């Protein structure tokens, strides 16, 4: 049959928040639509404005001896006038008395774009990179640099990055298999299978982020501060959707490609001459990174299987330098970035842990009803679906032919 | 079936640290996810702000008759005004009265980029190098140099490096194997195997760091000085993640490459003609160092196996000069670099040692559940996984075909 989405009843309203002036309630999901069913709408929260009983009195420690930026971030006094922006809106450079003192002291450096986006936020489900939560325009008055071999140019290193090494390396692989069975006795039988696999990687650099004493962007801290004190599933699920659930503490950059090819053959002769011939083919290719000119040409050449020259491979490898992607990650939980000096920071961290665990528990493929004949279940926008093998071409993998 | 990540219960909160104003606790990991299980979040620490009972009185002894840099690093008075920066930010060059006295005395020398980044910190698991903890711009009023034959240029030697030898040498290795067994009696059988291995290495230089009277960067000393006095697993694990566990006391630089080929064949005939033919290949190529134009060209030329010209080998050889890598290391523990002149430095050394032992004990392949039919177990980002030979293609290496 067809299975429709069904959702749980709502919970009880919370009390009025003195500062947000809102109340919250939540529900749960039981079954996803399957077999041309209705997909779930995923509205798992609710909010309604209220009238608080107590005034919102919220205070945090002042900088003290440190400077107060116009955006609220406390920075050190020695950074009042130099060659860099530290408050995030050039709030400190607008009151320079006299004699600016750049930290690099006339040395020639360049701002690396490779290190300006490091530390991508990653959703645990789907592994889609997001915008980095860090602020990599902050230098803390230092002139740390590093040299790139290809261009003989020194790139200055941000504060949050603890390691940035430019390196040249590559990988390749080519595995093929071939089996063949022939049975005859009249009677006959012939079998043939063939598997191919080509995969290669190109590496550009590798970075390591910091753990203690980091500086985050103002918008991230503002969105953290807006969280409710108690535990509301909807608001924390929204935060986890916006900012991901884990962030890349280290990774590598470059490009890659792949190719998968499967061949199948069958036959049977009897003697009532009954002869059958079965042929099933499937070719898959993928490619990521580089420039949109060389890469697609290389992708189309790889698909034919014809022998091609090295110049296009070199062109693509050289073009990787201007549009790299993220090939390796090392995930770390998002609640580690909560600033320590903040009202009820520990409660926010515990709640973020619980919300990540509940988010993993929900939106799970394990709740989908099992398919038939060893099919594979995939979850896609709140609707379960089955993937079928070569012989079966049903919606639920039930039609055999 | 499937195994999910599980972690031990929390430990008890410690007392409030009078200077950090925090308290810490920690837990452990019991099992990693395996067989499509949930990977571990690796949250082994916790921290929370507290209120101290006694005010934090923190100080270190001043230089005395030595100069006091603005970052705290003591340097000798004879270095107050010369041709080099010793404070790390040109704090000593801001009061040069008259008659500058450069140390090298007009001789033409260059800053060697090879020795400027020597002394990489190395993580014990994965052997990924990190940024050097030493500050290689300190010269201590010396003009030690060394000659490179290729360019006939003399390169200054920093204080921390005790040896800098430029030398040219090359190696190669070429081993092939071939077996062929034929068994028949009707009956028949034919077996055949073939193995390839090519590898050669290029050396550029070799360095040895110092042991006594070394100078470290300010940031490393500050990160050490912020550590809690007692033993807290989380904070010292964070320190290890940031700075690695070992640092290379000596090493070499250059490049290398590899090529690995495996062939396998089999047959079996019975007589009802039953015939079987299996053919299996596997090729791997790797290359590190050099420039991304010639290097990848040679990588591709190697795969096709045709005879190539020597000019590309020579071109890659000449380009290895501009982007060397770390081919050989000799690790030393990181706690040997804890300065003697510091509050409770010995306790920091003991804690670091115990934390390195604990970090080795966890994240070990030994807790992963074993595979079946001779599989190989690899741990990758908190998730055990099995590697299967040519014959088996199951998830647990149990499906044979």
């Amino acid at each position, epitope marked *: 049959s067809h299975i429709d989405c069904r959702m749980s009843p709502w919970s009880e309203w919370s*009390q009025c928040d003195p500062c947000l002036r809102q109340m919250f309630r939540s529900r749960s999901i039981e079954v996803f639509g399957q077999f041309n069913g209705k997909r779930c709408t995923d509205a798992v929260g609710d909010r309604r404005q209220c009238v608080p009983t107590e005034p919102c009195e919220d205070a945090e420690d002042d900088c003290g001896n440190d400077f107060q930026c116009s955006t609220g971030r406390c920075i050190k006094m020695r950074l009042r006038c130099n060659g860099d922006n530290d408050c995030g809106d050039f709030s400190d450079e607008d009151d320079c008395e006299s004699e600016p003192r750049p930290p690099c002291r006339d040395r020639v450096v360049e701002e690396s774009e490779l290190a300006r986006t490091a530390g991508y936020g990653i959703n645990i489900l789907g592994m889609d990179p997001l915008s980095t939560p860090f602020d990599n325009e902050f230098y803390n008055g230092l002139c740390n640099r590093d040299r790139d071999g290809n261009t003989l140019t020194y790139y200055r290193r941000p504060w949050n990055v603890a390691s940035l090494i430019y390196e040249t390396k590559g990988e390749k692989n080519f595995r093929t298999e071939h089996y063949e069975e022939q049975i005859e006795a009249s009677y006959s039988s012939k079998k043939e299978k063939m598997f191919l696999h080509v995969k290669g990687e190109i590496h550009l650099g590798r970075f390591v982020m910091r753990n203690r004493d980091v500086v985050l962007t103002t918008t991230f801290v503002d969105d953290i501060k807006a969280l409710p004190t108690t535990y509301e599933k909807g608001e924390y699920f929204a935060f986890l959707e916006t900012y991901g659930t884990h962030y890349s503490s280290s990774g590598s950059l470059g490009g890659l490609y792949e190719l998968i090819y499967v061949l199948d053959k069958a036959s049977m002769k009897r003697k009532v001459n009954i002869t059958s011939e079965n042929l099933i083919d499937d070719v898959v290719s993928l490619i990521r990174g580089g420039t949109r000119k060389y890469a697609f040409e290389l992708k189309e050449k790889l698909l034919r299987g014809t022998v091609i020259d090295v110049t296009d491979f070199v062109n693509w490898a050289s073009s990787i330098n201007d549009a790299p992607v993220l090939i390796s990650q090392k995930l770390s939980p998002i609640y580690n970035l909560v600033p320590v000096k903040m009202k*009820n920071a*520990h*409660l926010k961290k515990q709640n973020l842990e619980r919300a990540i665990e509940d988010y993993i528990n929900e939106f799970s493929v394990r709740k989908c009803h099992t398919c038939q004949n060893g099919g594979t279940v995939i979850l896609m926008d709140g609707k379960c679906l089955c993937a079928c093998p070569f012989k079966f071409e049903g919606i639920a993998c039930e039609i055999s032919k | 079936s499937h195994i999910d990540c599980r972690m031990s219960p929390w430990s008890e*909160w410690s007392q409030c640290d009078p200077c950090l104003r925090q308290m810490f606790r920690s837990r452990s990991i019991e099992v990693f996810g395996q067989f499509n299980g949930k990977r571990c979040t690796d949250a082994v620490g916790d921290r929370r702000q507290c209120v101290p009972t006694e005010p934090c009185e923190d100080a270190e002894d001043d230089c005395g008759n030595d100069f006091q840099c603005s970052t705290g690093r003591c340097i000798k008075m004879r270095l107050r005004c010369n041709g080099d920066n010793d404070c790390g930010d040109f704090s000593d060059e801001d009061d040069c009265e008259s008659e500058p006295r450069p140390p090298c005395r007009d001789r033409v020398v260059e800053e060697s980029e090879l020795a400027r980044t020597a002394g990489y910190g190395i993580n014990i698991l994965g052997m990924d190098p990190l940024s050097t903890p030493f500050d290689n711009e300190f010269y201590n009023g010396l003009c030690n140099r060394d000659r490179d034959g290729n360019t006939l240029t003399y390169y200054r030697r920093p204080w921390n490096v005790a040896s800098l030898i430029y030398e040219t040498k090359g190696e190669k290795n070429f081993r092939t194997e071939h077996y062929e067994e034929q068994i028949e009696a009707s009956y028949s059988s034919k077996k055949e195997k073939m193995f390839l291995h090519v590898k050669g290495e290029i050396h550029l230089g070799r360095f040895v760091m110092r042991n006594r009277d070394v100078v470290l960067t300010t940031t490393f000393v500050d990160d050490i000085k912020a550590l809690p006095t007692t033993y807290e697993k989380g904070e010292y694990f964070a320190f290890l993640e940031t700075y690695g566990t070992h640092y290379s006391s000596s090493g070499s630089l250059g490049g290398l490459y590899e090529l690995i080929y495996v062939l396998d064949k089999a047959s079996m005939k019975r007589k009802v003609n039953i015939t079987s033919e299996n053919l299996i290949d596997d090729v791997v190529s790797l290359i590190r160092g050099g420039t991304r134009k010639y290097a990848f060209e040679l990588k591709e030329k190697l795969l096709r196996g045709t005879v190539i010209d020597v000019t590309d080998f020579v071109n890659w050889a000449s380009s290895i000069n501009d982007a060397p890598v770390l081919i050989s290391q000799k690790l030393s523990p990181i706690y040997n670099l804890v300065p003697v002149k510091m509050k409770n430095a010995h306790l920091k050394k003991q804690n670091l040692e115990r934390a390195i032992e604990d970090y080795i004990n966890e994240f070990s392949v030994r807790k992963c559940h074993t595979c079946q039919n001779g599989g190989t177990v690899i741990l990758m980002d908190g998730k055990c996984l099995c590697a299967c030979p040519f014959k088996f293609e199951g998830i647990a290496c149990e499906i044979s075909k």
Partner: antibody
Framework: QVQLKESGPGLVAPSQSLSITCTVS????????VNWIRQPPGKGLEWLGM???????DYNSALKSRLSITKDNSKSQVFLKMNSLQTDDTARYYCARDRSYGGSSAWFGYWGQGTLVTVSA | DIQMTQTTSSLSASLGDRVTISCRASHDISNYLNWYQQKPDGTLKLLIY???RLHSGVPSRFSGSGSGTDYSLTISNLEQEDVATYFCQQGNYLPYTFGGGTKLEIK
């Protein structure tokens, strides 16, 4: 509408335990902490102890071995247990709310009403 | 234990006059001071926290100032509803300590 009510025995033996209850209203104890303060006659105030919203307890250095604070967040009630009383423990006992969930520099915004406990000599 | 001293145990003034109450701390508490008011029959109420900040529900006649070690609480336009005893308490290191207490009278 934040308010706190207090209940005490009133008369205790010179060697008999205490049992004091401070029920809260207008807020939940899960995200706030409660402090206990006593005022001996003719003198000033004195901070005694504190319990966090989490469950952690802090005590003054002198009365560490005597005090005991317990919480029941279901009924929104706070208990104080003091044992082996002396004649100097006669004071007015207040309960006041903490600034936040707990673990930071604090001011006591909302106070109780006050309960006097006399130890017979 | 930080010791805070209030020298003026008593003070007498008339309506409409400015009165200043001085409270001096032992250590340096880093601008963490609070003022409490105690009318008779044991009622307490926080007026000034963080050494310059009016608590919600408190009229604007009360104001505080001071920094470092010496602080003062200034009452302007004294009325007949401001006859109480004022306390100073620190909140930097636990245990928290209160001051001696100054009783304000009107003549």
């Amino acid at each position: 509408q934040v308010q706190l009510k207090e209940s005490g025995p009133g008369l205790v033996a010179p060697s008999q335990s205490l049992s004091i209850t401070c029920t809260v209203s207008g807020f939940s104890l899960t995200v706030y902490g409660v402090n206990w303060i006593r005022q001996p006659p003719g003198k000033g105030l004195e901070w005694l102890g504190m319990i966090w919203g989490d469950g952690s307890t802090d005590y003054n250095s002198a009365l560490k071995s005597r005090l005991s604070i317990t919480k029941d967040n279901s009924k929104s009630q706070v208990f104080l247990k003091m044992n082996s009383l002396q004649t100097d423990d006669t004071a007015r006992y207040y309960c006041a709310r903490d600034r936040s969930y707990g673990g930071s520099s604090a001011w006591f915004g909302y106070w109780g009403q006050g309960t006097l406990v006399t130890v017979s000599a | 234990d930080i010791q805070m001293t209030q020298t003026t145990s008593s003070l007498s003034a008339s309506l409409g006059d400015r009165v200043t109450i001085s409270c001096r701390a032992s250590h340096d508490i880093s601008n963490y001071l609070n003022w409490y008011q105690q009318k008779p029959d044991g009622t307490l109420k926080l007026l000034i926290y963080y050494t310059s900040r009016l608590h919600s529900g408190v009229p604007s006649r009360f104001s505080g100032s001071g920094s470092g070690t010496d602080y003062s609480l200034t009452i302007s336009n004294l009325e007949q509803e401001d006859v109480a005893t004022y306390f100073c308490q620190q909140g930097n290191y636990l245990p928290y300590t209160f001051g001696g207490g100054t009783k304000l009278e009107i003549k």
